[PDB]
Ligand binder design. Structure first.
Ligand SMILES: [Br-]
Length: 219
């Protein structure tokens, strides 16, 4: 019952790497993905066994996490681990993108996603939810391939480098660099997706890390 295989498959998917079957999943993951540990506060890489680090476990350990204050806790995740794992996508020795795990509360469930970000630290190349428990046909449509496709090319930050992603009720404008369509008939799940990015792009999330990525830190 190791569903770390589904997690590896989802990381490969959002990275744009086609893999079919459990054997090919592991082989391509080992060839092309480099898990790394990141200190959230500084954005620096840290030493440690990134492949076996359990961020969910750390997030509830007194010595490994912090309680978020009510004002900080935009995504309603209650606590944040000190250290997170990210997944570098490798093309030879070059890093072509970085996959970030994010999570936040929906209407019924804690929703966990991977977001693939280019080496400008701003442009999204892929999004996939890998654990969510919203209602099938309503909030569960965060898994719809057409909704995920809308994220490609969107920018996380504006030119003041402040978080700018918006989940737009009724649908985003055609020209929008920052707007993504909300889920029709499921506004409350949609607000949870919004809150997830509000937290994870800010100062208590991957904000510091994505500043380092922007300034050339992955190559
Ligand atoms: Br966390």
């Amino acid at each position: 019952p190791g569903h770390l295989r589904d997690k590896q498959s989802k990381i490969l998917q959002v990275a744009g790497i086609e893999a079919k079957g459990s054997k090919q999943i592991v082989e391509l993951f080992n060839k092309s993905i480099e898990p790394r540990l990141v200190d959230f506060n500084t954005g620096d890489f840290v030493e440690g066994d990134a492949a076996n680090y359990d961020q969910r476990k750390a997030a509830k350990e007194a010595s490994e996490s912090i309680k978020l204050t009510a004002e900080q806790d935009k995504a309603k995740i209650q606590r944040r681990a000190n250290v997170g794992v990210v997944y570098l996508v490798k093309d030879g020795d070059k890093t072509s993108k970085v996959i970030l795990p994010v999570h936040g509360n929906g209407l019924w469930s804690m929703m966990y996603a991977f977001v693939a970000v280019e080496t400008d630290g701003n442009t999204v190349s892929g999004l996939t939810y890998y654990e969510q428990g919203e209602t099938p046909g309503l909030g569960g449509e965060v898994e719809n391939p057409a909704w995920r496709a809308q994220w490609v090319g969107k920018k996380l930050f504006d030119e003041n480098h402040k978080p700018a992603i918006k989940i737009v009720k009724g649908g985003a404008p055609q020209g929008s660099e920052h707007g993504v369509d909300g889920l029709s008939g499921a506004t409350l799940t949609s607000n949870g997706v919004q809150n997830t990015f509000d937290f994870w792009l800010g100062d208590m999330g991957f904000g510091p890390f994505l500043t380092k990525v922007r300034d050339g830190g992955l190559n």
